[PDB]
Design a protein. Structure first.
Lengths: 100, 541, 538, 520, 155, 51
């Protein structure tokens, strides 16, 4: 009746699709934003420090505001892209307070 | 006794084919495997539901707590899940409302029927049981109606219609987004004493223009539309003419060239001297006639030449490209003009009216605003969304598409009557079906009872997302229906929900009759197919 | 259920497990189908080493060719275990389980349960045991009919070898079996009858020797070759050196004391040789006419062989355990271990002892005994496979004829037993039986499966198997009404029926009894199994 | 990186979902291996053998599952086999259902895995009460009822056709091992096998059965009254615990050293002949020089016998384990031996020792099996362990519970009736215990081809009104009371099934996460 | 003998070719016979592209699933010619060929030649036509009644 | 059609084992196999035989 020797079970999601349940993922998403937050922590204020970024194409780009710093760093994580979207939205609407 | 004989039907179908029949255990393999994705739509259900981030293979990230938008991007290898996928898409394209109910019910009928198959009840009888139970469900929903609406014109009457739909997706924003959608529908519908005979309505009437930045409270309604486009030539007057006739040409403003390719032929130098002025006088004969009638705006779909743009700059005529063909006809509906691929000349009957056109920046980018006051509009409106992230505005668009899709679901049929929501009519159907199972003796009575148990997830899923105990508020809610007042009992979602009783009319939560009927039918047909199959045949990759 | 548990596994269930047991049964049946019967085909087996061994026995085919299927290994143990104790009926077990599965599988496809089918085989098996009591015939052993034993010996030998080897090797078995019967009536096959390999002139020159033959002879040239009257002596004592439990150095001090202590090596050996000389002094009369021979189970030192050579005593060393348990039966003497207590009563008697050598090896022949209680069968052969073919033929022939003397009954063969059970199971009233329900086809399935064996004999001859049973069926229809008890047969020479009573075709009693019992147990257990799987740590 | 973990932590609800699905998968393998119409199972071990059986314990020994939750279910069969010896498949099939029924609640109604445990102990306490009430006592000395009690388990095996002989075979063997409280043990039950022969002539014979023959040919093959004497040391010359290292100086020493080797074996043989035994069974090997002078007195010498058999010979013949030969007396010599005889079988020789049959030490015996092949012997041997296991429970406990699922169905009815009066939070797991207890009957019905729907509905209607002994006939598939059906099982097997199945669920329900690949 | 001509060739002759023909027919029968009748099961033809399709006709099942065995290709081609001209009865063709080869092979193992076996099928086939033309019944379709067409369509 | 079933029920024995029946002219091949080395013996019998 069967076509062959054995029949391996189907994975519901595609092979290699990452997924997780519980409170661990939302903590990882929050910790991902805090990891991006720590880069812009000492930049805030008049006595703050600039950030030097060098992308894969080897073009130097120094900046103080968080609008173009986040544009240079191509963000993979969706939760960390939330800070990048509001920074460009704040840069597009007002133009101040992108780090705060 | 080391190597098997290797199943001597291996001369039959190739190794890539996999058979997963029954008796072997197909039903047990399937109903279970799909419990993972059943919890996905269950957790994303209700006003306190959790949105799910889906990153496709291209990288376009989306975040939507529905079911049709999620499962479209999920590449699912399991074939039995795919019956539930496009069955949910049918709800999206037809009614645009009830994706999640479909998922939490079609899957729950398979989950709750574990007891029937495990006990040893015939699969053919289960299909006959749910079909007869489906017929009783459709007939019984008509009697529990208390929201017979006949006006369906005023804005305050839509508060019982749009606000329950908007309250599900992003519950925190009710009054603001309902004002945008309700004010949009009032601009769409015409002003008349009695509009009947099934007036036409379509989802393409209300469009969504997404603008980056700005709080959600600062949004506003625009009767025209807003394009991310650069005007050319001059600045507008904005109050001087008081009204503007807008011609929309399909073909570009240029000398009429043929489809077959030609070139310039000159036998002598006398034609060479006049060729420089001939092209200028040719367009001048066709362009001067347009300016005589006072057409203060021209829209050409294809690329406009510089010679045609130069003559229009001195007279102060607005130009606009609009390359896409779908959005070209929507501008014609605003002004009330017809497309004209012929150049010809402007006529008064075919030319529309537009009050004013003004240019500014809403979110830093220069845009063209076609807002008009005191003008006549017919089936056109837009909602300018202001938001912090593009990812959030994508969900507001689909929430508005589901909101206006419900308006299509009301006005297209003769009646889109309301029902009690918030876990009120679902528990009533459990009492109706429980009494119906005892009327007909037979072996199919077990299928009728288990069909009622599948409706239990609707109240408790609101309680699970609310952080409440299911074993307290759910059995306490049954005591409230003992006995009008007993029909308007529902599930409360608040810190004072220890009592588990909240009146529906205080906040006016309601659901559609046609949406639940189509959802119950597609849900039963989805469970009918999964329980009817016994053999599943795969293939390589 | 098994794939989520085990990451790698194979599982067949509810249709493939039934097809596997039937397909593997039909496959293994086709191998041994052609070998069954007298005109069957021979089968050689050559491994990677390159040696050759030729025989028609199904046990040799099964216990030399490695097999991977899980069904056939149970048929291999069943065919082997039935033959290992009985010595006959190997392929018959494979044909029954090979046919009873396919004959029941057609009704499993119809939808009959395997449990009630096997219930019909068991209650049908009890009817065959009741039929063996009425079908067998009593035979008294007091007559001592040598012609009856000759016909039984030709039943198995004609199947393995041709008529040229059967006629010369048949009386070799009959003379060996004629001495088995005695007043005690205790059968003894392994100790009494033996087989020994010897590359010689041809297989046709196999002869019978009444005494025990040995594969060794006299080492020294001066020791006597032929002895007329040799009185044997059994001694299990080892007459070479012994290392002596931790005993160490013969600490010698001077050079004269060195060889003085080396001479003590002979004193332990000479202490035992003197007892043999004292025994020879008692039997010293007629020393040139008579003789003396010593047979040791362990090795003898070469220093002591010269002692026996001077007194003209024949020496034989390193005998087997079985030969020491046979000298008392042949020569009539008694065994001895220690050299302390000797007597002339334990010495045996032999009428002729001579040796013959070929190449490097040398054989010692003993015969012409007064009252030999045992004997041997020295088989001659050309090649190694010729000895292996004669090994299986003599091994299966002695066990088949020996079982006739164990009991007082014998079963005629040539399909008479299977054809008789066919009419018995198909004509017996079912109300007498206790089986009811869907046991109708189980009686017909097992009754019809027995018919395939006697026509497999016909399939090797090339005649039409269905047509040569027409007159057989017509004979039994009139034989019951004619008031004449006769048993038909299947003669493959002319393609017509025969009578095994006058032709001499016979079969043992416990062969057919144990065959159906072992076959019904294996075939029933394979039918009830509805799932195959492999799992374990490796 | 961090410690050897966090590959893919299955946490939350999905971890328990895999365990219920994994625990259910173990029962699905042997779902058809229950009832009288149960199917057999041929498992292929990687070494090269084969195991043909239907017992759930013997099936789960050979299988190997790479999952930690399913392995705890695998060990429950060893709990049942090494406690009674019957009902191993009943233990595995019931637990699967208990874990499965409790699952709906764990997955959906969110009852925490501790409240289910508290509900099950009260169900366990009530299960022993109704199982104690439903069981009726039975007389232990009634051989007519004892034969029908022993063959209850044989009916679910291949040898039901020979049940008239197996009950007589098992009853005689159990009474032999039974000591006059009434403690018996199967270590002396010899499982020696003989390939081939018919089952009808197979019979138990009082005594032992060796695989070896006598050494010397002149030994008496037929003795009327053997007198057995057990020896532990070898008859060879003992080298000693320390090296001798004899410094030889004279020529008359080496022949003396080899002569005392002959005299020491004479000294130990001559003192054995003080009592004049007929059969001397040595544990270790024997020398060639010593056997002759034991034959001069009339003894019989054998090869090295492993002491597992000598301990059986000590209880049969009444002899004692003796190593020092100088302290050999006449009181410790075995006596009252029935008969000595050696049969010829082509496999190996076999020496028979029969007993005179006429408190003291418990007597041993050897059960002869004459099967069709090797697998038939191992199949029948496990049936005797399953059949003789039933005979121990009736002696240790005179109670007798009804079979055919009537006992477990009685648990289902009382737990279902009492669940209504148990109003509270424990009501939902307490009511789910009855849902699994009514499945054993369901499994039996499903293997008969019957329909579980109307039969179980007819069962519950007649169980409250008709009697407490109602059950399903596995062969015919109709409702037949156990009193007229005449098949009964012990109550001890029902206790271990309910206890082991519920106690297994309490362990597995507490599993939160699964982390694989930590260290060895 | 064939290896001397082409070493890369193979050949099964007179016992292995017969088992291949019967086992492939019985293997095709055991899979495809379940769709016969109203209580038959539904098959899901899931190809590599993810296209799902429900059906019970043997024509479309064998068309999408390529056949590896050489015997079942001949049976699939017979179902194609059956479905082409008629459009119904494909499941009866594969069951009759599977059963005819099963019942015939039962007698080939008994030592009967295949020639006279096939001669009996043709005489039995011609005998069925002389039975079929008498077994049929004639009705008048000029009335164009709806009740007869409904129950015939319902079947 | 693309590939045969490659002799089913061949797992009864090992892959290395092969059968050679009298049919298919194999007894003629065994006579031809004798003919290979037999012709070597033709040049080696007699007084004029070649080593
Ligand atoms: N002269 C000032 N005195 C006190 N605070 C200041 C002064 N100038 C800037 N700040 C503070 O420094 C913070 C960061 O400003 P800055 O980083 O320069 O702007 P942005 O974040 O928009 O790039 C602001 O929140 C502001 O309150
Ligand atoms: N404030 C509220 N109080 C009570 N119930 C609410 C409230 N807001 C939303 N709901 C309920 O949440 C449910 C969400 O249903 P939803 O899945 O969005 O409908 P559909 O499946 O038709 O899209 C609605 O049925 C509604 O009754
Ligand atoms: N010359 C013969 N004439 C008729 N029947 C024979 C002859 N030789 C053997 N047989 C039959 O062949 C069957 C098998 O014989 P045998 O080779 O001894 O057993 P097995 O084939 O099982 O090893 C016997 O039942 C016997 O009756
Ligand atoms: N003849 C029968 N009819 C109905 N049920 C039976 C019968 N024999 C045994 N059973 C049921 O099968 C279960 C297991 O019995 P048995 O097969 O002897 O043990 P095991 O499961 O260890 O093989 C018992 O609980 C009993 O209720
Ligand atoms: N309702 C029914 N009751 C009994 N037999 C039926 C019924 N419907 C169809 N059959 C039988 O099934 C056979 C095949 O019919 P059908 O399934 O329509 O063709 P196919 O097997 O090619 O799909 C017919 O010969 C007919 O006798
Ligand atoms: Mg700043
Ligand atoms: Mg909604
Ligand atoms: Mg034979
Ligand atoms: Mg049992
Ligand atoms: Mg049809």
């Amino acid at each position: 009746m069967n076509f062959g020797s054995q029949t391996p079970t189907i994975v519901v999601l595609k092979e290699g699709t990452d997924a997780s349940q519980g409170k661990g993922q939302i903590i990882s998403n929050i910790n991902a934003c805090v990891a991006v937050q720590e880069a812009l922590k000492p930049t805030l204020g008049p006595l703050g420090s600039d950030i030097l970024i060098v992308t894969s194409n080897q073009k130097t780009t120094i900046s103080n505001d968080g609008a173009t710093i986040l544009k240079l760093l191509d963000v993979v994580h969706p939760a960390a892209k939330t800070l990048v979207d509001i920074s460009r939205a704040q840069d597009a609407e007002v133009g101040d307070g992108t780090t705060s | 006794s080391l190597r098997l004989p290797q199943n001597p039907n291996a001369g039959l179908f190739k190794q890539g084919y996999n058979s997963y029949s029954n008796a072997d255990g197909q039903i047990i393999k399937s109903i279970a495997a799909i419990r993972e994705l059943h919890q996905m739509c269950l957790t994303s259900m209700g006003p306190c539901g959790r949105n799910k981030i889906i990153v496709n293979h291209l990288g376009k990230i989306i975040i939507t707590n529905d079911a049709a938008t999620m499962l479209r991007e999920l590449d699912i290898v399991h074939p039995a899940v795919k019956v539930l996928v496009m069955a949910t898409e049918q709800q999206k394209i037809d009614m645009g409302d009830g994706t999640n109910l479909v998922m939490i019910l079609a899957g729950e009928l398979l989950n709750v029927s574990e007891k029937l198959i495990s006990m040893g009840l015939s699969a053919v009888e289960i299909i006959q049981g749910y079909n007869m139970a489906r017929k009783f469900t459709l007939k019984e929903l008509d009697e529990m109606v208390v929201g017979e609406i006949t006006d369906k014109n005023d804005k305050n009457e839509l508060l019982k219609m749009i606000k329950p739909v908007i309250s599900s997706k992003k519950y925190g924003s009710e009054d603001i987004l309902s004002e945008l959608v309700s004010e949009a529908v009032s601009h769409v519908l015409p002003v008349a004493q009695q509009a009947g005979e099934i007036p036409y309505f379509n989802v393409d009437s209300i469009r969504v223009v997404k603008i980056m930045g700005g709080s959600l409270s600062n949004s506003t309604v625009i009767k025209g539309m807003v394009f991310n486009r650069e005007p050319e030539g001059h600045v507008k007057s904005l109050s001087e003419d008081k009204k503007h006739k807008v011609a929309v040409f399909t073909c570009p403003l240029d000398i009429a060239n043929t489809e077959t390719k030609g070139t310039v032929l000159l036998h002598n130098a006398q034609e060479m001297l006049d060729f420089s002025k001939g092209e200028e006088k040719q367009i001048d004969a066709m362009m001067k006639e347009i300016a005589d009638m006072g057409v203060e705006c021209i829209v050409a779909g294809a690329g406009v030449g510089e010679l045609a743009l130069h003559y229009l700059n001195r007279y102060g005529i607005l130009v606009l490209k609009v390359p896409s063909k779908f959005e070209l006809r929507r501008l014609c509906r605003v002004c009330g003009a017809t497309p004209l691929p012929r150049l010809g000349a402007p006529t008064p009957e075919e030319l529309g009216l537009v009050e004013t056109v003004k240019t500014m920046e809403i979110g830093g980018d220069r845009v063209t605003v076609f807002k008009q006051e005191q003008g006549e509009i017919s089936r056109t409106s837009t909602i300018i969304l202001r938001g912090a992230t593009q990812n959030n505005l994508d969900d507001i668009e689909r929430a508005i598409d589901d909101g206006v899709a419900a308006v299509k679901g009301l006005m297209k049929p003769s009646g889109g009557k309301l029902l009690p929501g918030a876990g009120a009519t679902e528990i009533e159907l459990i009492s109706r079906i429980t009494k119906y199972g005892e009327r007909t003796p037979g072996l199919l009575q077990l299928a009728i009872k288990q069909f009622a148990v599948a409706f239990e997830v609707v109240p408790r899923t609101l309680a699970e997302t609310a952080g409440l105990d299911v074993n307290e508020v759910l059995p306490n809610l049954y005591a409230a229906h003992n006995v009008t007042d007993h029909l308007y009992k529902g599930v409360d979602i608040d810190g004072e929900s220890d009592e588990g009783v909240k009146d529906i009319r205080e906040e006016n939560i309601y659901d559609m009759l046609a949406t639940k009927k189509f959802a119950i039918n597609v849900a039963t047909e989805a469970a009918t197919t999964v329980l009817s199959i016994d053999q599943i045949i795969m293939a390589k990759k | 259920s098994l794939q989520l548990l085990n990451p790698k596994a194979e599982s067949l269930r509810r249709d493939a497990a039934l097809k596997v047991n039937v397909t593997s049964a039909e496959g293994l049946q086709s191998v041994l189908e052609t070998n069954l019967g007298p005109k069957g085909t021979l089968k050689m087996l050559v491994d990677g080493a390159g040696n050759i061994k030729l025989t028609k026995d199904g046990k040799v085919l099964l216990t030399e060719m490695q097999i991977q299927s899980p069904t056939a290994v149970l048929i291999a143990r069943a065919a082997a275990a039935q033959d290992e104790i009985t010595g006959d009926g190997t392929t018959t077990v494979v044909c029954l389980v090979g046919e009873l599965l396919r004959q029941a599988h057609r009704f499993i496809q119809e939808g009959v349960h395997p449990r009630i089918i096997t219930d019909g085989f068991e209650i049908a098996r009890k009817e065959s045991m009741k039929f063996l009591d009425e079908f067998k015939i009593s035979k008294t052993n007091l007559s001592n009919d040598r012609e009856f034993l000759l016909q039984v010996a030709r039943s198995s030998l004609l199947t393995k070898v041709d008529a040229d080897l059967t006629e010369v090797l048949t009386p070799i078995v009959t003379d060996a079996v004629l001495s088995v019967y005695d007043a005690q009536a205790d059968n003894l096959d392994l100790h009494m009858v033996e087989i020994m390999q010897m590359q010689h002139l041809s297989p046709k020159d196999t002869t019978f020797i009444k005494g025990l033959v040995l594969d060794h002879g006299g080492r020294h040239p001066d020791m006597p070759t032929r002895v007329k009257n040799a009185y044997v002596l059994i001694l299990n004592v080892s007459l070479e050196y012994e290392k002596t439990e931790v005993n160490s150095g013969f600490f010698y001090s001077s050079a004269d004391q060195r060889d003085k202590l080396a001479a003590s090596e002979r004193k332990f050996v000479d202490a035992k040789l003197k007892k043999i000389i004292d025994l020879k002094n008692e039997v010293c009369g007629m020393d040139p006419d008579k003789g003396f021979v010593i047979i040791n189970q362990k090795g003898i030192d070469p220093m002591s062989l010269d002692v026996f050579a001077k007194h003209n005593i024949l020496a034989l060393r390193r005998a087997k355990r079985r030969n020491m348990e046979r000298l008392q039966l042949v020569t009539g003497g008694e065994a001895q271990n220690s050299v302390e207590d000797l007597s002339p009563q334990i010495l045996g008697f032999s009428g002729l002892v001579y040796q013959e050598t070929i190449g490097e090896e040398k054989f010692t022949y003993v015969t012409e005994n007064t009252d030999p209680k045992s004997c041997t069968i020295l088989i001659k052969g050309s090649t190694h496979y010729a000895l292996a073919q004669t090994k299986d033929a003599v091994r299966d022939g002695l066990r088949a004829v020996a079982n006739v003397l164990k009991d007082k009954n014998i079963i005629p063969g040539a399909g008479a037993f299977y054809i008789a059970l066919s009419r018995y199971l198909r004509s017996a009233n079912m109300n007498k039986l206790g089986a009811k329900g869907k046991t109708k086809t189980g009686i017909e399935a097992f009754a019809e499966a027995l018919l395939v064996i006697p026509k497999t004999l016909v399939k090797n001859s090339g005649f039409d198997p269905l047509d040569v049973l027409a007159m057989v069926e017509d004979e039994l229809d009139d034989a019951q009404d004619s008031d004449e008890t006769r048993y038909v047969g299947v003669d493959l020479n002319i393609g017509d029926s025969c009578d095994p009573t006058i032709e001499g075709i016979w079969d043992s009693y416990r062969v057919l009894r144990n065959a159906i019992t072992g076959a019904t147990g294996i075939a029933s257990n394979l039918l009830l199994c509805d799932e195959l799987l492999r799992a374990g740590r490796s | 990186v961090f410690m050897n973990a966090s590959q893919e932590r299955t946490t939350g609800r999905q971890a328990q979902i895999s365990n219920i699905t994994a625990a259910k998968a173990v029962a699905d393998v042997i779902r058809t291996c229950l009832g009288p119409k149960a199917m057999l199972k041929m498992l292929l071990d990687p070494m090269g053998g084969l195991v043909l059986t239907n017992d759930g314990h013997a099936i789960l020994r050979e299988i190997d599952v790479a999952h930690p939750a399913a392995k705890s279910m695998l060990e429950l069969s060893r709990t049942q086999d090494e406690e009674v010896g019957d009902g191993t498949t009943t233990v595995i099939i019931l637990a699967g259902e208990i874990l499965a029924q409790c699952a709906p609640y764990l997955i959906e109604k969110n009852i925490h895995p501790v409240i289910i445990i508290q509900a099950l102990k009260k169900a366990l306490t009530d299960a022993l009460e109704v199982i104690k009430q439903v069981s009726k006592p039975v007389d232990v000395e009634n051989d007519a009822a004892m034969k029908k009690l022993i063959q209850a388990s044989i009916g679910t095996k291949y040898v039901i056709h020979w049940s008239e002989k197996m009950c007589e075979l098992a009853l005689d063997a159990v009474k032999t091992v039974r000591k006059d409280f009434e403690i018996d043990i199967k270590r002396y039950v010899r499982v020696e096998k003989i390939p081939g022969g018919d089952v009808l002539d197979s019979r138990v014979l009082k005594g032992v059965l060796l695989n070896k023959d006598v050494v010397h040919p002149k030994m008496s093959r037929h003795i009327e009254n053997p007198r057995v004497v057990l020896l532990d040391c070898p008859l060879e010359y003992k080298k000693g615990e320390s090296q001798t290292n004899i410094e030889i100086e004279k020529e008359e020493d080496w022949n003396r050293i080899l002569q005392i080797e002959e005299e020491q074996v004479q000294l130990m043989c001559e003192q054995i002949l003080a009592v004049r035994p007929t059969l001397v069974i040595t544990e270790k090997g024997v020398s060639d020089l010593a056997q002759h002078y034991l034959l001069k007195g009339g003894c019989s010498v054998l090869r090295r016998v492993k002491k597992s058999d000598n301990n059986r010979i000590a209880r049969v013949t009444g002899a004692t384990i003796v190593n020092r030969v100088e302290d050999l007396k006449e009181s410790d010599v075995g006596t009252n031996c029935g008969l000595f005889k050696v049969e010829m079988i082509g496999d190996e020789y076999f020496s028979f020792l029969d007993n005179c049959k006429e408190s003291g030490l418990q007597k041993a015996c050897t059960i002869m099996l004459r099967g069709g092949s090797k697998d038939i012997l191992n199949e029948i041997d496990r049936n005797l362990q399953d059949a003789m296991a039933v005979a121990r429970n009736v002696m240790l406990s005179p109670s007798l519970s009804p079979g055919g699922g009537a006992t477990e169905m009685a648990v289902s009815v009382k737990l279902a009736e009492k669940a209504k009066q148990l109003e509270g939070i424990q009501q939902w797991p307490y009511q789910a215990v009855a849902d699994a207890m009514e499945c054993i009957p369901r499994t039996l019905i499903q293997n008969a081809g019957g329909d579980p729907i109307r039969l179980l509905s007819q069962l519950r209607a007649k169980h409250a009104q008709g009697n407490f002994t109602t059950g399903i006939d596995g062969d015919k598939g109709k409702i037949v009371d156990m009193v007229s059906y005449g098949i009964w099982e012990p109550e001890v097997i029902k206790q271990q099934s309910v206890k082991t199945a519920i106690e297994s669920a309490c362990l597995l329900l507490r599993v939160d996460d699964i982390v694989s690949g930590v260290r060895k």
